[PDB]
Amino acid sequence: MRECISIHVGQAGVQIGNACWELYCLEHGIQPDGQMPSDKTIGGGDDSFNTFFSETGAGKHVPRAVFVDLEPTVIDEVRTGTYRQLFHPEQLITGKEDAANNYARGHYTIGKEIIDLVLDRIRKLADQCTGLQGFLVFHSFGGGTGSGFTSLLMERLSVDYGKKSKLEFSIYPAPQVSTAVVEPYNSILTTHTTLEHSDCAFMVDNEAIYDICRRNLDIERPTYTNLNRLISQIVSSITASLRFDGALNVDLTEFQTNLVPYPRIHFPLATYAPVISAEKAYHEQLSVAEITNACFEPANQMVKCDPRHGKYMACCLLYRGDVVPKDVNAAIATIKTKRSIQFVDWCPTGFKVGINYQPPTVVPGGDLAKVQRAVCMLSNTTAIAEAWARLDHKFDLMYAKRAFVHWYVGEGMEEGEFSEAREDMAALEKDYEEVGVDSVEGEGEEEGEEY
Amino acid sequence: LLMERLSVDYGKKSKLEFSIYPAPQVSTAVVEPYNSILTTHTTLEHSDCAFMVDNEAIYDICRRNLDIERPTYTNLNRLISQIVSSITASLRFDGALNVDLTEFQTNLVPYPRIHFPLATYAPVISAEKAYHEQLSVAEITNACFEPANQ
Amino acid sequence: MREIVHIQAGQCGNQIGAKFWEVISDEHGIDPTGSYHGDSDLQLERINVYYNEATGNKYVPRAILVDLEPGTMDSVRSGPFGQIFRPDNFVFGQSGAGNNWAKGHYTEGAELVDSVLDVVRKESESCDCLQGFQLTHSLGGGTGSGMGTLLISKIREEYPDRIMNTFSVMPSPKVSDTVVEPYNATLSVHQLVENTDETYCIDNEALYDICFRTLKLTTPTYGDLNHLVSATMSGVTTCLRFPGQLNADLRKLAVNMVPFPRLHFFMPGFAPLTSRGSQQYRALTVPELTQQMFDSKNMMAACDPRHGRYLTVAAIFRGRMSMKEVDEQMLNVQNKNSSYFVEWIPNNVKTAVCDIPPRGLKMSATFIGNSTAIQELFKRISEQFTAMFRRKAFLHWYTGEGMDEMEFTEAESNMNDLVSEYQQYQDATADEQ
Amino acid sequence: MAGASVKVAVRVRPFNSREMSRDSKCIIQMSGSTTTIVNPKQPKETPKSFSFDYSYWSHTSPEDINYASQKQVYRDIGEEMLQHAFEGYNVCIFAYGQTGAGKSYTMMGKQEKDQQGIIPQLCEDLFSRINDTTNDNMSYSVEVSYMEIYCERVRDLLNPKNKGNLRVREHPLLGPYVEDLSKLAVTSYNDIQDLMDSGNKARTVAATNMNETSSRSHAVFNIIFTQKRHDAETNITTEKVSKISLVDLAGSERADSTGAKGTRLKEGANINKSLTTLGKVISALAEMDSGP
Ligand SMILES: CC(=O)O[C@H]1C(=O)[C@@]2(C)[C@H]([C@H](OC(=O)c3ccccc3)[C@]3(O)C[C@H](OC(=O)[C@H](O)[C@@H](NC(=O)c4ccccc4)c4ccccc4)C(C)=C1C3(C)C)[C@]1(OC(C)=O)CO[C@@H]1C[C@@H]2O
Ligand SMILES: Nc1nc2c(ncn2[C@@H]2O[C@H](COP(=O)(O)OP(=O)(O)OP(=O)(O)O)[C@@H](O)[C@H]2O)c(=O)[nH]1
Ligand SMILES: Nc1ncnc2c1ncn2[C@@H]1O[C@H](COP(=O)(O)OP(=O)(O)NP(=O)(O)O)[C@@H](O)[C@H]1O
Ligand SMILES: Nc1nc2c(ncn2[C@@H]2O[C@H](COP(=O)(O)OP(=O)(O)O)[C@@H](O)[C@H]2O)c(=O)[nH]1
Ligand SMILES: [Mg+2]
């Protein structure tokens, strides 16, 4: 039994959860009301996969999900939407104000009195599992709730459960476009907790998705639904290894064993290669080599950073559909001989390969074409530091004058935390700088049997 | 082990051997020489007269005389069986001059430690070549001394 | 009565074992349900080597299946030969090792090893006269390498006079499906060098090369590679099951092939291979089998035998053939390629002949070579291992499960000694100094 | 590094009570550095003969000419090897023989402490030399350990606990070693005698046709020896460290002699394997010494 618990905090978290659960209900043949007519027609099967859904005696299937947010509107929407009967009515929404883009409000002042309910419901969900795998936490940096409340949650889960893997999906402020003025402060603050308590945090930017949607899918006016659908597709690709049979299966422990060199380096980038509209789905082969090459291209990166400016430390490839190992073997051999892709000299192997037989599904009303083959790449590299370095500058420009600081201090924080935070982000970048350097000389190669 | 125990128990009765010695070139084992050298002691002390044969020689005889280009162990075994039958024929059937098993030992071994004679059978010939030839007594006696027939 | 107990751990070992049992069941004419529907009489003569007898003339194999995740057990049970195995031998846990050697050998495997050993003892005590064991596994993974080495250690401690074999899939030079492979391969070879009498080295790259070039397959899949390996496994132990003109048990191959105790890593091979649609052009005879068998491109070890010297070779033939042809061909192979055979062994080719060939092949042969070129594999692993150990690439995942750095070093030393020992009997003369 | 100068010695003991009771005959005869031995059942062909670097005739106890006295053999071997030890290099003694031949004797000596074997002479010269040499500007440390090899498993003798197997390891700089191997310090040779007796009581022994008490396992008695200097400077350092390994080898075995089945044959087989490996390494070391 391979179960895993989904947590959704903040507005970005719950919209991503909406797209996710739509996709999963479509994958498992589950109606929006929770009934599955496939088993009734066939007479029985394993289609009620226990990973995300728990099956009751009456035949209903409830999701192993816990939504949380301080604004009732974004979840009053889903309490009266199409999927109002899918979710358990205990949703843990606070009937109060919101963090108001304030880490201190979400962590110290309003974060209390709601934390307890969330841990009891997570305990109740965990008690129903036999051999729980881990947590998938969805939230967004920059938001008051998604930063502070997520930090408090992460701390309490680390104290309680400890050994369970706790993966994170997050939305970083973009270089240029932004939706708020105090994004850097909340980022610099939650980095200290996402560094220690998370085990592997996946990292996504909005501008990259906008460029990908404009270029490949030919959508000139994208909205948040398309972004959430792409993220949901990625999470499906990650989790499909423990829901369907495959030639080479990759569990959630193999991820961390294969993608995290040192304990403080767990910030991979994510990519989905065959993103293409229905019209352009023709006139192309979409062979395994094509999608494998398209993963590595800088343009298809889902965070605004150039891989060519760093060095690759690890890569995980997860294929879906009609894929045989020899094509992946040839594609890896072709990539290893390219000179624009540099691998560090302390990882001669470099790659992890996983293959799954279930092909990707097509959401009605979506934009992604039906394809026979798909691949998702998760690459741990040093270029990510650049994406951090930019934001830091803005925070210092904001901190040198002490702008907007009385709001944070009034909610119960002090100035040294802002100070302590900068130091923490300052170091992490140092570590990313050290791991990228080549070996020195070995300090050896002495003479010997010179006789 | 068996020859040791038999020599202890019975003692005075004769004991003959018919053994396959390793060939100079071809063999079906890598640890053959150790086994042969370790065996030579008990072959020497206890046995009274030991005959030796070689698979390579019999292969060459089969190729040259019987025109069998791909012989197997059955043919070699048949030839050895003919040898042993000719050895023991004097005990069974009537003859003008009869030779017992002990007469072989009395006439063939000079000293106790040199009881290692070779054996040969002269008229090995195929049915097709059985004609075109007389196979008289002198011919077979001469063929027995040919070095190629050993 | 020479009984063999078969074990298999990990995904790779389980898949290979499934294909192997399908092959052997075809050989002896056992239906998937377990009943006998063969034609010849000799098939039941020695069925007790691999099978036990149930009540209603039904046979059940001696397989023991081990893993730390239920996925592969479910896959094997829901298969063409799922119901042939005994249900009580499916031993498994949950939350598998996850490509982590320490989890497999020191933490998670320590719980399942007792149950696995109990089942192994139960199966072994029922045999009339046990000969040896087997184990199919892969060194690049967690469950396979870890649990396999632990099982080998415990069983060798318990039964010290029987013959332990193993068919191990080594990491490949180029094609790689894990990133932490060298640690697992090294910390493992460290145990296989000590606790095993014979090891046969398999590599994915060589098998892919055979499929692409010899068999001319356009889309090779893992079923084919399992097929090849299973054919070899069946070929090795033929003389225990069928009569012949010159027999060779596992122990005879052990005695003849191994000069010194720590040199027991073999390169296997099988002939012939017509690739289909080319059978009518190729005439099948013993010289053709010997020609294809010794070819450098036929091996499944991904080592070039021309870069070293053959310490010893063994050829097991299956069919009706003349012994003179076999002996002459082996002599010719030895003489014509005298540079590639060591000089201080006067003859280094064991030969055996069996009378019953495979399903639809007038003749067949299998090859077990022992040469110094295999050292290259170990050297390559070392050339990766240290490159990841100088800067401690992925070490914290291993030390978090209780393993002192010293264990890593005590091993890189052991494999390096193995490479040096093989390198000694490699130069084609030794004099002067 | 130093040349592998291996010294081969053989020694003949006198008669025991049982042999004296029977009308036995002496068959070993020595001359110079060559010893010859005859067959009682085959007295016609020839004696067999061997040559060794040292041949010692301790057959006739009251003999005055060419008698191999224990002080003599100690001067031959132990004095020079203790001198080598004090230079800071390692020393190894191997004792070999079959029940009766007289191994222990050469290693220990008589019980009246009047004619001392190798061990008392070496240890007393070590202790005495140091006691009559140490000064304010030097310090000496001595420790002892005692282990056994049985069926390729290491077992401790000094420790009286349950005799579980220990685990050999390989410290990267210091070489092979054994975990949880008891190590103790000693002050005088009486302490070493007490520890040696206590350990010898714990050795595994089994009866056979040849003798009622036969060694079934090898033993190693290690003496760790350390010298520390106090120079006219704040930096106080250890000059060097040396080890003395006094080793007892079990005799070669043949089912043509020990007809027991089961564990007894297995122990003999393992013993023979170990002896063959030991001879293989020792001869190679001598060749290494000889070549250059
Ligand atoms: C000429 C003919 O009749 O067809 C052959 C054939 O074309 C060849 C190419 C066969 C064929 O093998 C393959 O195509 C193949 C594919 C992937 C991996 C390995 C082999 C054959 O499939 C394989 C099959 O072999 C057997 O049936 C043997 O008994 C073999 N057993 C199995 O293959 C087997 C597999 C699964 C289940 C049960 C049996 C065997 C050999 C030695 C010891 C034990 C078993 C045969 C005769 C052939 C075909 C059908 C084309 C070859 O295989 C064997 C083992 O015989 C490939 O090299 C040989 C040479 C043959 O000429
Ligand atoms: N990709 C994507 N990003 C989103 C989505 N919704 C919100 N965001 C991001 O979220 C950021 C705003 O912070 P939020 O996470 O919404 O903070 P919050 O949930 O409103 O919590 P409070 O600030 O306390 O009200 C914006 O900058 C967006 O980039 C979404 O649906 N998709
Ligand atoms: N060279 C010698 N001179 C005088 N007495 C000796 C001599 N060698 C041995 N002895 C004595 O004669 C007996 C023979 O020694 P013994 O204790 O039987 O050794 P062992 O049984 O041969 N030892 P081992 O080979 O390890 O089994 C003992 O009483 C010795 O003290
Ligand atoms: N020959 C062969 N090798 C395989 C197969 N499946 C996986 N492998 C190899 O096994 C390695 C991974 O080992 P794995 O099975 O995960 O080890 P485990 O997790 O402990 O069972 C990969 O590098 C593959 O090359 C197979 O069907 N055949
Ligand atoms: Mg909000």
mmCIF file of N, CA and C in Angstrom, chain A residues 1-2 133 199 245-249 253-254 256-263 313-314 324-326 329 336 345-353 434-439 442 451, chain C residues 11 15 69-71 75 94-100 103 174-182 208 212 218-222 383-384 387-388 390-397 433:
data_model
loop_
_atom_site.group_PDB
_atom_site.id
_atom_site.type_symbol
_atom_site.label_atom_id
_atom_site.label_comp_id
_atom_site.label_asym_id
_atom_site.label_seq_id
_atom_site.Cartn_x
_atom_site.Cartn_y
_atom_site.Cartn_z
ATOM 1 N N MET A 1 0.867 -1.210 0.000
ATOM 2 C CA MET A 1 0.000 0.000 0.000
ATOM 3 C C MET A 1 0.889 1.241 0.000
ATOM 4 N N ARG A 2 0.845 2.016 -1.086
ATOM 5 C CA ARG A 2 1.701 3.192 -1.242
ATOM 6 C C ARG A 2 0.819 4.434 -1.201
ATOM 7 N N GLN A 133 3.867 7.048 2.588
ATOM 8 C CA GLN A 133 5.095 7.406 1.887
ATOM 9 C C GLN A 133 5.573 8.809 2.242
ATOM 10 N N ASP A 199 12.472 18.192 2.542
ATOM 11 C CA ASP A 199 13.419 17.202 2.045
ATOM 12 C C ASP A 199 13.762 17.376 0.577
ATOM 13 N N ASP A 245 1.772 -0.055 -13.267
ATOM 14 C CA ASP A 245 2.917 -0.910 -13.526
ATOM 15 C C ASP A 245 3.869 -0.240 -14.513
ATOM 16 N N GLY A 246 5.129 -0.655 -14.466
ATOM 17 C CA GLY A 246 6.133 -0.106 -15.361
ATOM 18 C C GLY A 246 7.342 -1.009 -15.428
ATOM 19 N N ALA A 247 8.189 -0.741 -16.421
ATOM 20 C CA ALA A 247 9.396 -1.540 -16.595
ATOM 21 C C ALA A 247 10.445 -1.192 -15.549
ATOM 22 N N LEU A 248 10.612 0.097 -15.254
ATOM 23 C CA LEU A 248 11.555 0.571 -14.243
ATOM 24 C C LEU A 248 10.833 1.605 -13.396
ATOM 25 N N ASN A 249 10.485 1.237 -12.169
ATOM 26 C CA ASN A 249 9.662 2.081 -11.317
ATOM 27 C C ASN A 249 10.532 2.835 -10.324
ATOM 28 N N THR A 253 11.465 7.439 -2.255
ATOM 29 C CA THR A 253 12.770 7.397 -1.605
ATOM 30 C C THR A 253 13.906 7.419 -2.620
ATOM 31 N N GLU A 254 13.704 6.805 -3.790
ATOM 32 C CA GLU A 254 14.748 6.806 -4.809
ATOM 33 C C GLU A 254 15.018 8.215 -5.309
ATOM 34 N N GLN A 256 14.978 11.030 -3.611
ATOM 35 C CA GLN A 256 15.857 11.741 -2.702
ATOM 36 C C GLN A 256 17.238 11.109 -2.656
ATOM 37 N N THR A 257 17.320 9.779 -2.725
ATOM 38 C CA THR A 257 18.633 9.145 -2.722
ATOM 39 C C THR A 257 19.434 9.505 -3.964
ATOM 40 N N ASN A 258 18.761 9.774 -5.082
ATOM 41 C CA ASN A 258 19.428 9.967 -6.360
ATOM 42 C C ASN A 258 19.573 11.425 -6.770
ATOM 43 N N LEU A 259 18.874 12.353 -6.114
ATOM 44 C CA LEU A 259 18.808 13.741 -6.558
ATOM 45 C C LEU A 259 19.358 14.758 -5.564
ATOM 46 N N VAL A 260 19.760 14.341 -4.369
ATOM 47 C CA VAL A 260 20.175 15.243 -3.303
ATOM 48 C C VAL A 260 21.593 14.870 -2.880
ATOM 49 N N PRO A 261 22.624 15.543 -3.423
ATOM 50 C CA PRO A 261 23.997 15.215 -3.018
ATOM 51 C C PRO A 261 24.279 15.470 -1.546
ATOM 52 N N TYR A 262 24.037 16.686 -1.075
ATOM 53 C CA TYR A 262 24.266 17.083 0.305
ATOM 54 C C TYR A 262 22.960 17.597 0.886
ATOM 55 N N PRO A 263 22.822 17.611 2.216
ATOM 56 C CA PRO A 263 21.500 17.886 2.802
ATOM 57 C C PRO A 263 20.953 19.273 2.516
ATOM 58 N N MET A 313 24.354 18.483 -11.570
ATOM 59 C CA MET A 313 24.770 17.538 -10.548
ATOM 60 C C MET A 313 23.946 16.266 -10.558
ATOM 61 N N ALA A 314 22.662 16.350 -10.893
ATOM 62 C CA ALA A 314 21.859 15.138 -10.985
ATOM 63 C C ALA A 314 20.700 15.364 -11.939
ATOM 64 N N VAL A 324 10.493 2.231 -24.794
ATOM 65 C CA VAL A 324 11.310 1.042 -24.558
ATOM 66 C C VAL A 324 12.674 1.505 -24.059
ATOM 67 N N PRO A 325 13.403 0.692 -23.288
ATOM 68 C CA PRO A 325 14.647 1.191 -22.681
ATOM 69 C C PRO A 325 15.722 1.583 -23.678
ATOM 70 N N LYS A 326 15.802 0.921 -24.835
ATOM 71 C CA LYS A 326 16.911 1.181 -25.748
ATOM 72 C C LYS A 326 16.876 2.602 -26.295
ATOM 73 N N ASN A 329 18.263 4.774 -23.657
ATOM 74 C CA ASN A 329 19.700 4.540 -23.616
ATOM 75 C C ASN A 329 20.410 5.353 -24.689
ATOM 76 N N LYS A 336 25.168 12.828 -23.548
ATOM 77 C CA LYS A 336 26.457 12.856 -22.865
ATOM 78 C C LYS A 336 27.585 13.371 -23.750
ATOM 79 N N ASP A 345 32.564 16.876 -12.415
ATOM 80 C CA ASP A 345 33.497 15.761 -12.531
ATOM 81 C C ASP A 345 33.363 14.748 -11.399
ATOM 82 N N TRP A 346 32.558 15.030 -10.372
ATOM 83 C CA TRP A 346 32.301 14.073 -9.298
ATOM 84 C C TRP A 346 30.945 13.385 -9.433
ATOM 85 N N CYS A 347 30.439 13.228 -10.652
ATOM 86 C CA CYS A 347 29.243 12.433 -10.923
ATOM 87 C C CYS A 347 29.403 11.835 -12.314
ATOM 88 N N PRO A 348 30.259 10.822 -12.465
ATOM 89 C CA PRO A 348 30.436 10.219 -13.796
ATOM 90 C C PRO A 348 29.168 9.615 -14.360
ATOM 91 N N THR A 349 28.289 9.095 -13.506
ATOM 92 C CA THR A 349 27.073 8.449 -13.987
ATOM 93 C C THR A 349 26.042 9.477 -14.432
ATOM 94 N N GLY A 350 25.528 10.264 -13.498
ATOM 95 C CA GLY A 350 24.712 11.427 -13.809
ATOM 96 C C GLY A 350 23.202 11.290 -13.864
ATOM 97 N N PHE A 351 22.684 10.156 -14.335
ATOM 98 C CA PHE A 351 21.283 10.034 -14.726
ATOM 99 C C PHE A 351 20.559 8.947 -13.945
ATOM 100 N N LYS A 352 19.268 9.177 -13.712
ATOM 101 C CA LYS A 352 18.325 8.172 -13.242
ATOM 102 C C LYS A 352 17.200 8.073 -14.263
ATOM 103 N N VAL A 353 16.766 6.846 -14.546
ATOM 104 C CA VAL A 353 15.780 6.563 -15.582
ATOM 105 C C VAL A 353 14.615 5.820 -14.949
ATOM 106 N N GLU A 434 30.442 26.587 -3.800
ATOM 107 C CA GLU A 434 31.504 25.607 -3.572
ATOM 108 C C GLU A 434 31.273 24.291 -4.290
ATOM 109 N N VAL A 435 30.051 23.765 -4.290
ATOM 110 C CA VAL A 435 29.845 22.448 -4.890
ATOM 111 C C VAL A 435 30.105 22.449 -6.395
ATOM 112 N N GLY A 436 30.036 23.606 -7.049
ATOM 113 C CA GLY A 436 30.235 23.660 -8.484
ATOM 114 C C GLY A 436 31.674 23.628 -8.954
ATOM 115 N N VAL A 437 32.644 23.766 -8.050
ATOM 116 C CA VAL A 437 34.040 23.847 -8.464
ATOM 117 C C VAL A 437 34.576 22.451 -8.750
ATOM 118 N N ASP A 438 35.539 22.368 -9.663
ATOM 119 C CA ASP A 438 36.134 21.087 -10.010
ATOM 120 C C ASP A 438 37.058 20.600 -8.900
ATOM 121 N N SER A 439 37.406 19.317 -8.973
ATOM 122 C CA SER A 439 38.373 18.751 -8.048
ATOM 123 C C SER A 439 39.715 19.454 -8.220
ATOM 124 N N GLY A 442 43.604 16.233 -6.735
ATOM 125 C CA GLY A 442 43.796 14.962 -6.075
ATOM 126 C C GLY A 442 44.883 14.953 -5.024
ATOM 127 N N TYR A 451 62.984 1.798 -10.172
ATOM 128 C CA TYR A 451 64.208 0.971 -10.000
ATOM 129 C C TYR A 451 64.036 -0.355 -10.748
ATOM 130 N N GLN C 11 13.987 -6.625 -8.253
ATOM 131 C CA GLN C 11 13.194 -6.594 -9.478
ATOM 132 C C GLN C 11 13.874 -7.376 -10.594
ATOM 133 N N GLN C 15 12.428 -10.877 -12.304
ATOM 134 C CA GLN C 15 12.053 -10.986 -13.709
ATOM 135 C C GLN C 15 12.833 -12.106 -14.389
ATOM 136 N N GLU C 69 9.248 -4.610 -1.694
ATOM 137 C CA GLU C 69 8.096 -3.859 -2.161
ATOM 138 C C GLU C 69 7.157 -4.844 -2.848
ATOM 139 N N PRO C 70 5.839 -4.740 -2.671
ATOM 140 C CA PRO C 70 4.949 -5.779 -3.196
ATOM 141 C C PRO C 70 4.647 -5.666 -4.681
ATOM 142 N N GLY C 71 5.181 -4.662 -5.378
ATOM 143 C CA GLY C 71 4.801 -4.460 -6.768
ATOM 144 C C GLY C 71 5.216 -5.608 -7.668
ATOM 145 N N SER C 75 3.121 -8.361 -9.845
ATOM 146 C CA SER C 75 3.328 -8.537 -11.278
ATOM 147 C C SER C 75 3.572 -9.999 -11.629
ATOM 148 N N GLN C 94 7.421 -3.810 2.956
ATOM 149 C CA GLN C 94 6.943 -2.584 2.330
ATOM 150 C C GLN C 94 7.941 -1.470 2.597
ATOM 151 N N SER C 95 7.846 -0.411 1.794
ATOM 152 C CA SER C 95 8.776 0.713 1.866
ATOM 153 C C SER C 95 10.206 0.234 1.608
ATOM 154 N N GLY C 96 10.422 -0.183 0.365
ATOM 155 C CA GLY C 96 11.670 -0.803 -0.030
ATOM 156 C C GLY C 96 12.909 0.035 0.189
ATOM 157 N N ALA C 97 14.069 -0.539 -0.133
ATOM 158 C CA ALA C 97 15.334 0.114 0.177
ATOM 159 C C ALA C 97 15.471 1.435 -0.563
ATOM 160 N N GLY C 98 15.150 1.448 -1.846
ATOM 161 C CA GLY C 98 15.242 2.663 -2.623
ATOM 162 C C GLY C 98 16.655 2.976 -3.059
ATOM 163 N N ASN C 99 17.291 2.032 -3.750
ATOM 164 C CA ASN C 99 18.631 2.184 -4.308
ATOM 165 C C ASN C 99 19.683 2.487 -3.245
ATOM 166 N N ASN C 100 19.392 2.198 -1.981
ATOM 167 C CA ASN C 100 20.270 2.505 -0.860
ATOM 168 C C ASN C 100 20.784 1.191 -0.295
ATOM 169 N N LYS C 103 20.193 0.597 3.585
ATOM 170 C CA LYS C 103 18.837 0.183 3.935
ATOM 171 C C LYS C 103 18.641 -1.300 3.662
ATOM 172 N N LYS C 174 28.672 2.644 -20.109
ATOM 173 C CA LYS C 174 27.994 3.829 -20.618
ATOM 174 C C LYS C 174 26.543 3.929 -20.191
ATOM 175 N N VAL C 175 25.740 2.897 -20.437
ATOM 176 C CA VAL C 175 24.306 2.971 -20.172
ATOM 177 C C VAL C 175 24.127 2.862 -18.659
ATOM 178 N N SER C 176 23.484 3.863 -18.067
ATOM 179 C CA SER C 176 23.324 3.959 -16.623
ATOM 180 C C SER C 176 21.899 4.376 -16.305
ATOM 181 N N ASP C 177 21.246 3.618 -15.422
ATOM 182 C CA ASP C 177 19.892 3.914 -14.970
ATOM 183 C C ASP C 177 19.830 4.219 -13.478
ATOM 184 N N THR C 178 20.976 4.427 -12.830
ATOM 185 C CA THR C 178 21.031 4.940 -11.468
ATOM 186 C C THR C 178 22.241 5.853 -11.374
ATOM 187 N N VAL C 179 22.253 6.698 -10.341
ATOM 188 C CA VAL C 179 23.350 7.649 -10.167
ATOM 189 C C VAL C 179 24.304 7.212 -9.059
ATOM 190 N N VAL C 180 23.817 6.463 -8.072
ATOM 191 C CA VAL C 180 24.610 6.047 -6.923
ATOM 192 C C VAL C 180 25.090 4.615 -7.136
ATOM 193 N N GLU C 181 25.188 4.199 -8.397
ATOM 194 C CA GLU C 181 25.540 2.813 -8.713
ATOM 195 C C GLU C 181 26.902 2.389 -8.178
ATOM 196 N N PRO C 182 27.984 3.162 -8.353
ATOM 197 C CA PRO C 182 29.312 2.650 -7.969
ATOM 198 C C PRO C 182 29.452 2.282 -6.503
ATOM 199 N N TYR C 208 22.556 -6.005 -25.189
ATOM 200 C CA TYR C 208 22.018 -5.111 -26.207
ATOM 201 C C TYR C 208 22.820 -5.215 -27.491
ATOM 202 N N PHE C 212 21.201 -6.244 -31.062
ATOM 203 C CA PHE C 212 21.215 -5.321 -32.191
ATOM 204 C C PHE C 212 22.002 -5.883 -33.364
ATOM 205 N N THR C 218 15.051 -5.113 -34.009
ATOM 206 C CA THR C 218 14.928 -3.667 -34.144
ATOM 207 C C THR C 218 14.517 -3.011 -32.830
ATOM 208 N N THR C 219 13.717 -3.695 -32.011
ATOM 209 C CA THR C 219 13.221 -3.165 -30.741
ATOM 210 C C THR C 219 13.479 -4.187 -29.644
ATOM 211 N N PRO C 220 14.717 -4.301 -29.168
ATOM 212 C CA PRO C 220 14.973 -5.173 -28.021
ATOM 213 C C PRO C 220 14.220 -4.691 -26.796
ATOM 214 N N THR C 221 13.825 -5.644 -25.962
ATOM 215 C CA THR C 221 13.177 -5.363 -24.692
ATOM 216 C C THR C 221 13.762 -6.298 -23.646
ATOM 217 N N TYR C 222 13.430 -6.039 -22.381
ATOM 218 C CA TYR C 222 14.029 -6.799 -21.291
ATOM 219 C C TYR C 222 13.677 -8.277 -21.353
ATOM 220 N N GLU C 383 37.410 3.599 -10.963
ATOM 221 C CA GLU C 383 37.644 4.906 -11.559
ATOM 222 C C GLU C 383 36.449 5.826 -11.388
ATOM 223 N N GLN C 384 35.257 5.275 -11.157
ATOM 224 C CA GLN C 384 34.113 6.097 -10.796
ATOM 225 C C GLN C 384 34.014 6.279 -9.292
ATOM 226 N N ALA C 387 36.077 8.866 -7.664
ATOM 227 C CA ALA C 387 35.674 10.178 -8.152
ATOM 228 C C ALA C 387 34.469 10.714 -7.401
ATOM 229 N N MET C 388 33.646 9.833 -6.831
ATOM 230 C CA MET C 388 32.509 10.243 -6.026
ATOM 231 C C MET C 388 32.818 10.260 -4.537
ATOM 232 N N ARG C 390 36.009 11.162 -3.088
ATOM 233 C CA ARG C 390 36.925 12.207 -2.647
ATOM 234 C C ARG C 390 36.160 13.379 -2.057
ATOM 235 N N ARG C 391 35.046 13.753 -2.684
ATOM 236 C CA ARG C 391 34.244 14.880 -2.228
ATOM 237 C C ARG C 391 32.948 14.456 -1.548
ATOM 238 N N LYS C 392 32.762 13.163 -1.276
ATOM 239 C CA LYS C 392 31.623 12.668 -0.503
ATOM 240 C C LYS C 392 30.299 13.076 -1.145
ATOM 241 N N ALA C 393 30.067 12.540 -2.344
ATOM 242 C CA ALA C 393 28.937 12.984 -3.150
ATOM 243 C C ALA C 393 27.613 12.724 -2.446
ATOM 244 N N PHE C 394 27.266 11.454 -2.239
ATOM 245 C CA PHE C 394 25.956 11.062 -1.729
ATOM 246 C C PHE C 394 26.100 10.263 -0.446
ATOM 247 N N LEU C 395 27.056 10.647 0.393
ATOM 248 C CA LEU C 395 27.433 9.808 1.518
ATOM 249 C C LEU C 395 26.451 9.886 2.673
ATOM 250 N N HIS C 396 25.792 11.028 2.878
ATOM 251 C CA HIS C 396 24.984 11.176 4.083
ATOM 252 C C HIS C 396 23.802 10.215 4.085
ATOM 253 N N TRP C 397 23.298 9.848 2.905
ATOM 254 C CA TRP C 397 22.236 8.850 2.833
ATOM 255 C C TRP C 397 22.701 7.502 3.359
ATOM 256 N N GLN C 433 63.670 -9.670 -14.519
ATOM 257 C CA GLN C 433 63.364 -9.204 -13.170
ATOM 258 C C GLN C 433 61.844 -9.104 -13.062
#
